[PDB]
């Protein structure tokens, strides 16, 4: 009934503290390639659920992919749910080719079986992903431990009580970057710094706080420090510095000595809302010296424009080539060696303008005769690596993107440019 | 700087109607968590739960069975409690205490206490 | 939910010298989400230490705590007439906050 998966990485979403009222994960691992405004791709996504002991399955539906065009795709489609279950899911696009799929755990996207169970658990999500060569990559996130959904808990007690500031927090790929000036009275070799956030909308309460504890000593200028947001964990996690422009090393009293925090929390969902409300709780303290509780609060807004290109990591390497016989080796890709069941690698040339007359140039480990990719011939050789070799060149910088996968391996790409 | 001021010594009914205030102040009453614990003298400290002054997310005890109700109002830096229920074995000194420092969703330890409320139910 | 046992329950030990009280977890608990609180008889309790191993600002020398996994110690190393309080080891992070049984501490005279 549904489609048979090519090269599946599953993944394994650990959830850190609660759940604050979305569900994201995010996808690295399938390619867009660079230099194509003809790659489109097809997404399918089917979620397993659990209702009350018995086995559930929610089919959605994102269509094409256009990647220059659109950043947050919502989906179009559903097959094993509820009401209006499209307004309940976003696909978002980070850069360097990674989505992000986000959904409302506080409003219920399925109800077949039963009416009134409440115990519906995420247990798996599982994402197709359809190659513009016709690579079927798909994805599996599955719960270390499912958490059950509480809909609909009367969120909006919005409150206004903290120090207002005039300017505004960004989200930019779900990424919030915030730099707050504040004043603290102690000194930097007296101070133990500690802040915590807390984003508050439509239905999400998010908590952020530094699991480094207190900062230890305050260092002058750049102080780093790890931050621990609520909700599903992602890599390159947040962050914060407080950079101390302040001199100070016996402080005099009443001097309130100016401070720099910047802070980068990393799992922010789009569902916050427009105009939403971000709390920053700052204290310093030491033997219950000064650095009294403060907070700061102000408006996080979202970017919808990508900020960045959403063209995977390349390599971009030069050949200096002669006459017309161009020549170039492929490595082996990270996590493979030469037991390897399936190992695909494909090839086209650069801004290609043409669908059905580019993306012939597919070669596996049992096959090397494409069908009609032309003056490109593929060698599969020994030591696990492949020889690409392009004829009929000449006085024309010509450009090939690369791109080699495995069975258990990441996906990479590679940028050659044949000059001379 | 922080001060957990409870109120109310409270000789209440079988049939459950009680309050406690805990007044506080010395800092952002709304970054912190409070939590209450319960001290029967039955030698042991139990939790009875939390709430967020900045979100209103209220957390009670699994033993209690739903009979716990911890609101907050932030105009007055106070958080009310109520344990209304058919109380039987309910008599304990009720502590309202506050956390050490900033936790994500009511885990930090418990670093200032306050006075103490007694509550005692009897006919 | 997690349930928590203190095995000393009652030292009644002589004026000075180390008195080590053991919390045992039935589960594996996180080496930084157990705290240990001194409740002196009337007043309220205090915290003692509370990363299982961080001690908590005022609190004297002779308060060192110990643990991993789940067999949790405080050593009480330097007794004296002013510990005669009873002392119980917390469980936080998990919904169900656990505490555990006391331990009465005695001051020999």
């Known amino acids: 009934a549904l489609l048979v998966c090519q090269y599946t990485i599953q993944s394994l979403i650990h959830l850190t503290g609660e759940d604050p009222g979305f569900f994201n994960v995010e996808i690295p691992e399938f390619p867009f390639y660079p230099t194509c405004n003809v790659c489109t791709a097809d997404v399918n996504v089917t979620i397993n659920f659990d209702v009350g002991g018995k086995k559930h399955q929610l089919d959605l539906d994102f269509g094409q992919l256009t990647p220059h065009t659109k950043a947050v795709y919502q989906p179009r489609g559903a097959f094993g749910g509820s009401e209006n279950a499209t307004n309940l899911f976003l696909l978002e696009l980070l850069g360097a080719g990674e989505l992000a799929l986000t959904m409302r755990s506080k409003k219920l996207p399925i109800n077949v079986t039963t009416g009134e169970e409440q115990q519906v658990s995420l247990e798996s999500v599982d994402v197709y992903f359809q190659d513009v060569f016709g690579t079927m990559w798909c994805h599996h996130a599955e719960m270390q431990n499912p958490v059950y959904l509480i809909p609909e808990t009367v969120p909006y007690i919005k409150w206004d009580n903290c120090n207002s500031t005039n300017i505004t927090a960004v989200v930019r790929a779900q990424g919030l970057d915030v730099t707050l000036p504040l004043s603290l009275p102690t000194s930097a070799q007296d101070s133990n710094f500690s802040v915590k956030t807390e984003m508050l909308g439509n239905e999400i309460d998010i908590e952020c706080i530094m699991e480094d504890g207190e900062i230890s000593q305050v260092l002058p200028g750049d102080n780093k420090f790890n931050i621990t947001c609520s909700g599903y964990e992602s890599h390159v996690p947040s962050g914060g510095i407080l950079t101390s422009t302040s001199p100070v090393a016996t402080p005099i009293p009443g001097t309130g000595y100016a401070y720099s925090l910047r802070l980068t929390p990393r799992p922010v969902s789009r569902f916050l809302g427009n105009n939403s409300i971000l709390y920053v709780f700052y204290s310093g303290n030491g033997p219950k010296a000064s650095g009294g509780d403060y907070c700061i609060q102000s408006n996080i807004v979202f970017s919808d424009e990508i900020p960045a290109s959403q063209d995977m990591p390349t390599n971009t390497t030069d050949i200096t080539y002669v006459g017309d016989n161009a020549t170039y080796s492929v490595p082996m890709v990270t996590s493979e060696d030469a037991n390897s069941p399936n190992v695909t690698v494909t090839a086209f040339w650069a801004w290609p303008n043409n669908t059905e007359t580019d993306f012939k140039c597919k070669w596996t480990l049992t096959s090397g005769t494409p069908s009609g990719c032309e003056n490109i011939s593929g060698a599969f050789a020994s030591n696990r690596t492949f020889d690409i070799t392009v004829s009929g060149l000449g006085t024309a910088p010509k450009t090939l993107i690369i791109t080699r996968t495995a069975t258990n391996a990441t996906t990479t790409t590679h940028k050659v440019i044949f000059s001379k | 700087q922080v001060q957990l001021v409870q109120s109310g010594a409270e000789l209440k009914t079988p049939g459950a109607s009680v309050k406690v205030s805990c007044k506080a102040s010395?800092?952002?009453?709304?970054?912190?968590?409070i939590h209450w614990v319960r001290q029967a003298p039955g030698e042991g400290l139990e939790w009875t739960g939390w709430?967020?002054?900045?979100?209103?997310?209220?957390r009670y005890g699994q033993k209690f069975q739903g009979r716990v109700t911890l609101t907050s109002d932030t105009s007055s830096s106070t958080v009310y409690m109520e344990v209304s229920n058919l109380t039987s074995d309910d008599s304990a000194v009720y502590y309202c205490?506050?956390?050490?420092?900033?936790?994500?969703?009511?885990?930090?330890?418990?670093?200032?206490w306050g006075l103490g409320t007694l509550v005692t139910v009897s006919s | 939910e997690i349930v928590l046992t203190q095995s000393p329950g009652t030292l009644s030990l002589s004026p000075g010298e180390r008195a080590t009280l053991s919390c045992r977890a039935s589960?594996?608990?996180?080496?930084?989400?157990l705290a240990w609180y001194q409740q002196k008889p009337g007043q309220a309790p205090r915290l003692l230490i509370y990363?299982?191993?961080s001690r908590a600002t005022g609190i004297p020398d002779r308060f060192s705590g110990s643990g991993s996994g789940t067999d949790f110690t405080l050593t009480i190393s330097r007794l004296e007439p002013e510990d005669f309080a009873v002392y119980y080891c917390?469980?936080?992070?998990?919904?169900?906050?656990?505490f555990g049984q006391g331990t009465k501490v005695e001051i020999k005279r």
């Open positions: 589960q594996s608990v996180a080496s930084k989400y």
């Open positions: 990363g299982a191993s």
């Open positions: 917390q469980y936080y992070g998990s919904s169900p906050l656990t």
């Open positions: 205490a506050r956390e050490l420092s900033y936790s994500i969703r009511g885990t930090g330890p418990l670093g200032y």
């Open positions: 709430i967020n002054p900045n979100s209103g997310a209220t």
């Open positions: 010395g800092y952002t009453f709304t970054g912190y968590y």
